[PDB]
Write a protein that binds this DNA or RNA. Structure first.
Lengths: 196, 74, 259, 207, 157
RNA sequence: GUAGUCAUAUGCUUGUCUCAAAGAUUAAGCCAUGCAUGUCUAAGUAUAAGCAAUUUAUACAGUGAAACUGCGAAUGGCUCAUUAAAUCAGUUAUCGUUUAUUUGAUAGUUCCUUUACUACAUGGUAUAACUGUGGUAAUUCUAGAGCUAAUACAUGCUUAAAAUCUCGACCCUUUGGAAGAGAGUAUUUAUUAGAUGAUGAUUCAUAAUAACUUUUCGAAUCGCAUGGCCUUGUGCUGGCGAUGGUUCAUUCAAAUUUCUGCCCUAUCAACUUUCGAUGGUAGGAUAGUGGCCUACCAUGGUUUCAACGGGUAACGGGAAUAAGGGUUCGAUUCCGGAGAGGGAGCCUGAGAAACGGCUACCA
């Protein structure tokens, strides 16, 4: 059983191959998103807690929280479901998917690191992702820099964020986003106009 | 105004006075890109699009424009 | 049927458009507007085949899409390939300040009458329905799908109003009663203009009307087809093809080649 | 596709009748919606339940499945208050609808006199509680209390049947609303012509 | 007690007055729904001072009449307030240049007001569909005498 | 007899000119191979040079990548296979039914919490798209990581007091001053209008009217046009459209719907009634008319003018001239119902009996 273990907090994507049978034996007959005690991995995982994130069969078949059945069932999917894409409302489809209960038939189980232990994994703690998109809605902006409500626009205009980068073209540009929600005079003009 | 004439006349009348130029075979390839694109996710699509036989309208204009400045007389 | 039609066939498009039979296969289908399908003239027809200002199809596409605004219908701008210009309308060609009447022939073909900046002001409206609506208020409605607020009360349902487009003001109306002038919007007798004789209502569901005119011809048509072009003999607008009166195939010959 | 096309019938002369058209969607026929009452939550917790159905034009039509309170009007007085309906009796259409306390547009039922009692009291100075204490007025008779009299003297000869009703707490009324269509259940209070009559159906029904 | 119950389980009107009328204890209380389809038709005297509750009537209901108006002889009196009128017309035959006889049968609704009889000429109006067949209501009845077979009787009425 | 055959019959095969026909016709033999309804800015979403392609708006230029959108993708087009049925023709308004489309119109009564209404220097979210981490014989696959939008979710006091509606004294003459006169709608019934619109017509409206309705309503628009107003920041000024909503009719419709008409047949005589054969009725469905049904009963009634009924593979049929004649048309069916393996159920929606949406089932 291969593991796609993700670490929220940092954004650590790691993959572990666990051949021996005895370890994985704890994931058997456990439901989706349950609390994993990754000590059945005395190795690098000394005192860890995971969440069974999702499933994938030896045939690419994902899991469906809810469909509690240790096997594959075939259902009609409506929008709002997983393993189902739209394209013209009512795209209802008889798509087949893998149960919620984990079984030996499972090829890949994803995991979510809740509480790491004393142990240290390289792929996980070594990361520091510079999430690129800074706030863009007027309100979300101020929420990050402080600035109480009463704060005028012009404040937020120059209080935004910018990004510099070198292009594959050896170019150096400066980019920045618009702030839909910004209270301008135009928005103000229109409202009076309307009530006029 | 040849500057009016240039905006109104049809793209085909212009290549005729040898001002606009060629009329390359779009059909076939465009039909084939539909092929790929209709089967991809945005990621690549963009890339593909960066390969569909030229002749943008944006292109038609710049060429129309050049005949504009560079020409004057009578 | 599947849903709602959406096209129109060369062959099937009204003889009022004096259309090109060989033409193509289709024909610009009138857009849902002020006038009914059959009783209308989509702009594309109005400029291409009519005025002839346009020509090829794209010619229009320019005119009505160009950021200059070259077409006006009843003091308003229009940019729809097939706006249904209907009877008694006023169309202005911006770039030339042309003013036209949308009127039928005497042979029933849509004709374009040239107006002077004078008539271009007033347009003739026929009264559709008349009833009181919201919060004790009176409303009148015109064929031209005009909805009127607080209208003069001396107006019966089958009336005809003179409209001052410039001020969106009414003035001098005139109902249909024994002794007036009228234009017939559609029928085996359209394009005619005469004196109303009398209106015999039959209520069973269809009232009729009679008429006289120049050569004192006897005309017969259903009320719904009578449009009061005026009160007591004096017409209110200049008519196309001289006076609204058609000739025997015999009178046409004698007038033209004098046989 | 429970349709309602008149094709699956037999023309006047009972000869079978032809078909070339598959059932077409505009002949829609929605699943019936029997309507019960919660005047007995012995099981049924959720008092009233109404589900909205997407109708043709694009509108919604609320469908009454389960209820407990509707609105009713006293013909005579021109009063109308929302009250709690009690038990359904005599459905005319069929007696089974009564057996399942289902709500048909014209199902005769019972209501709480409370709102009407409360009102008849405030406007006439007559509670209608057991007969003896009949009236309840003011101490001084100089001011506005002079009206409860004027009205009360309007020989408020409310039928001997209307009277008994109040005191008993129960009130007779028929409905005037399609629950399966609008989701509500509104009715008029029974009187004269029909009252006397529908009651008879009830007297003889049980006896 | 008769016109009201008579089997059926109730019979009011379109204008739900009644019991409330006891409020206007002086003028005239006994109101019934009154109407006039017009179209050059008199409203039956009997229709007004009747106790009958026929929703399918053209004088006692919100039942309209529009367009098609008929005159035909009556065939049967059976059925509850519904009758069959038979029309007798000639049909032309292109080739032989002559005619043949033909008869259409019509389902007609009869408000209690006018009194039927078999074999009389009747006048029907075009009212909305009232049932599978019905689509015509009686508006004016003329009594007529035919000594026997109604079928034999064939008149280009 | 006659030959010819102006009989073919096919049977032999040759400049320049075109109004120019060719697997409906068999089986309504299907998807080889070829192939395939998506989309745009005044306009709603793009990086303070990691869509980024410039270029230096510069607090949001274009410029577009992508997505979000938001739209059509119920259109046709081939298909009688059915179908003797209104199919269809006329021939019905629909007081009996629904309605995008399109306009036209258009909307003061939402508090009044017992205005820290907070204060609208117009809210909240939520997300993509997006960077990425992936998986797998392999998906329109998909996993888990992060992002961010927003004309999308989800909202949301409309103050600056006493809101704003609705009398009007009164003068004070107009600026009217007006006192102090009084105070919104989808969804329900229930009454009253309605004497003082309308119909033949109404229980019609459009009135109200209360109630009482997990019920609405109601531009957290964007676009240029920001120069006039006063203030001097101000207050506006919104202009104008874009972007809405509202209901009505506005065509859009359909959808009924009377009223004439398929081949023969009396060797069709009789027919039709368990729930419909009828009436009539309760309801319920129906979106909404209808026995359409739930009942409930009426016995109905159809019919030699042949009705019951039978039999005709039946899919199925617009122009105009014209003494006379001349001629001719629309164009291989104007018209116009029923198929898109079988079955089922479901799908979109203004709007499908959705063919070419599903599913799931069968094959």
């Amino acid at each position: 059983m291969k593991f796609n273990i993700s670490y929220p907090l940092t954004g650590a994507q790691k993959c572990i191959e666990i051949d021996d049978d005895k370890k994985c034996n704890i994931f058997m007959d456990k439901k989706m998103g349950q609390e994993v005690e990754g000590d059945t991995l005395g190795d690098e995982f000394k005192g860890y807690v995971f969440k069974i994130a999702g499933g994938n069969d030896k045939d690419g078949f994902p899991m469906k929280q809810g469909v509690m059945v240790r096997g594959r069932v075939r259902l009609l999917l409506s929008e709002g479901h997983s393993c189902f894409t739209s394209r013209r409302s009512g795209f209802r489809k008889r798509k087949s998917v893998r149960g919620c209960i984990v079984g030996p038939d499972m090829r890949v189980l994803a995991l979510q690191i809740v509480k790491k232990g004393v142990a240290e994994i390289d792929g996980l703690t070594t990361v520091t992702l510079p999430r690129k998109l800074g706030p863009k809605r007027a309100n979300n902006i101020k929420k990050l820099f402080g600035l109480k409500k009463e704060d005028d626009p012009i404040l937020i205009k120059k209080s935004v964020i910018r990004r510099t980068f070198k292009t594959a073209k050896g170019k150096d540009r400066t980019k920045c986003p618009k702030i839909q929600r910004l209270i301008t005079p135009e928005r103000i003009l229109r409202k009076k106009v309307y009530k006029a | 105004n040849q500057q009016y004439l240039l905006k109104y006349e049809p793209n085909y009348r212009l290549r005729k006075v040898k001002i606009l130029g060629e009329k390359p075979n779009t059909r076939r390839s465009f039909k084939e890109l539909k092929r790929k694109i209709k089967r991809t996710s945005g990621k690549a699509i963009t890339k593909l699009l960066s390969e569909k036989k030229g002749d943008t309208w944006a292109s038609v204009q710049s060429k129309k424009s050049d005949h504009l400045k560079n020409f004057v007389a009578k | 049927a599947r849903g709602p039609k959406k096209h129109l066939k060369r062959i099937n498009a009204p003889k009022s458009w004096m259309l090109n039979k060989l033409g193509g296969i289709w024909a610009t289908r009138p857009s849902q507007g002020p006038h009914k399908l059959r009783e209308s003239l989509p702009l594309s027809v109005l400029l291409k085949e009519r005025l002839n200002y346009a020509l090829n199809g794209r010619d229009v596409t320019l005119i009505l899409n160009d950021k200059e605004q070259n077409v006006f219908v009843d003091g308003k701008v229009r940019r729809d390939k097939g706006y249904p210009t209907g009877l008694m309308d006023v169309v202005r060609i911006e770039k030339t300040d042309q003013s036209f009447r949308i009127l039928y022939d005497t042979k029933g073909r849509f004709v374009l009458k040239s107006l002077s900046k004078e008539e271009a002001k007033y347009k003739l409206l026929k009264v559709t329905a008349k009833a009181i609506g919201p919060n004790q208020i009176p409303y009148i409605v015109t064929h031209d799908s005009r909805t009127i607020r607080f209208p003069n009360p001396e107006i019966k349902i089958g009336d005809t109003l003179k409209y001052d487009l410039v001020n969106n003001k009414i003035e001098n109306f005139a109902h249909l009663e024994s002794g007036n002038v009228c234009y017939i919007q559609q029928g085996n007798n359209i394009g005619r203009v005469g004196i109303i004789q009398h209106i015999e209502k039959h209520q069973g569901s269809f009232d009729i009307c009679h008429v006289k005119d120049a050569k004192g011809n006897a005309f017969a048509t259903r009320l719904g087809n009578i449009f009061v072009l005026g009160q007591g003999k004096k017409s209110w607008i200049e008519l196309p093809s001289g006076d609204g009166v058609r000739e025997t195939i015999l009178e046409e010959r004698k007038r033209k080649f004098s046989y | 596709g429970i349709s309602r096309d008149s094709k699956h019938k037999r023309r006047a002369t009972g000869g079978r009748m032809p078909v070339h058209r598959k059932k077409r969607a505009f002949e829609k026929g929605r699943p019936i919606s029997m309507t019960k009452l919660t005047t007995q939550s012995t099981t049924i917790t959720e008092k009233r339940r109404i589900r909205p159905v997407r109708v043709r034009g694009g509108h919604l039509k609320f469908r009454a499945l389960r209820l407990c309170e509707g609105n009713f009007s006293w013909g005579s007085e021109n009063i109308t208050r929302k009250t709690k309906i009690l038990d359904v009796k005599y459905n005319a259409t069929n007696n089974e609808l009564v057996r399942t306390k289902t709500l048909v547009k014209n199902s005769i039922v019972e209501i709480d006199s409370t709102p009407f009692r409360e009102w008849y009291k405030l406007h006439y100075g007559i509670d209608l509680g057991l007969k003896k204490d009949r009236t309840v007025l003011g101490n001084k008779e100089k001011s506005r209390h002079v009206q409860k009299r004027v009205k009360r003297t309007k020989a408020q000869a409310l039928e001997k049947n209307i009277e008994e009703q109040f005191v008993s707490q129960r009130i007779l009324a028929c409905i005037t609303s399609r629950p399966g269509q609008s989701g509500r259940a509104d009715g008029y209070i029974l009187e004269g012509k029909e009252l006397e009559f529908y009651i008879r159906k009830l007297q003889s029904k049980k006896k | 007690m008769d016109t009201q119950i008579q089997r059926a389980y109730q019979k009011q009107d379109g204008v739900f007055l009644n019991s409330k009328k006891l409020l206007a204890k002086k003028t005239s209380a006994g109101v019934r729904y009154y109407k006039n389809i017009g179209l050059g038709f008199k409203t039956p005297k009997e229709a007004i001072e009747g106790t009958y509750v026929d929703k399918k009537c053209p004088f006692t209901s919100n039942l309209s009449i529009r367009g098609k108006i008929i005159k035909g002889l009556v065939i049967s009196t059976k059925m509850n307030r519904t009758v069959i009128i038979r029309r007798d017309y000639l049909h032309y035959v292109r080739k032989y240049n002559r005619y043949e006889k033909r008869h259409r049968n019509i389902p007609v609704h009869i408000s209690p007001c006018f009194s039927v009889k078999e074999g009389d000429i009747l006048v029907a109006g075009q009212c909305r569909p009232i049932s599978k067949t019905v689509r015509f209501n009686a508006l004016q009845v003329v009594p007529n005498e035919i000594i026997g077979s109604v079928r034999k009787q064939f008149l280009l009425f």
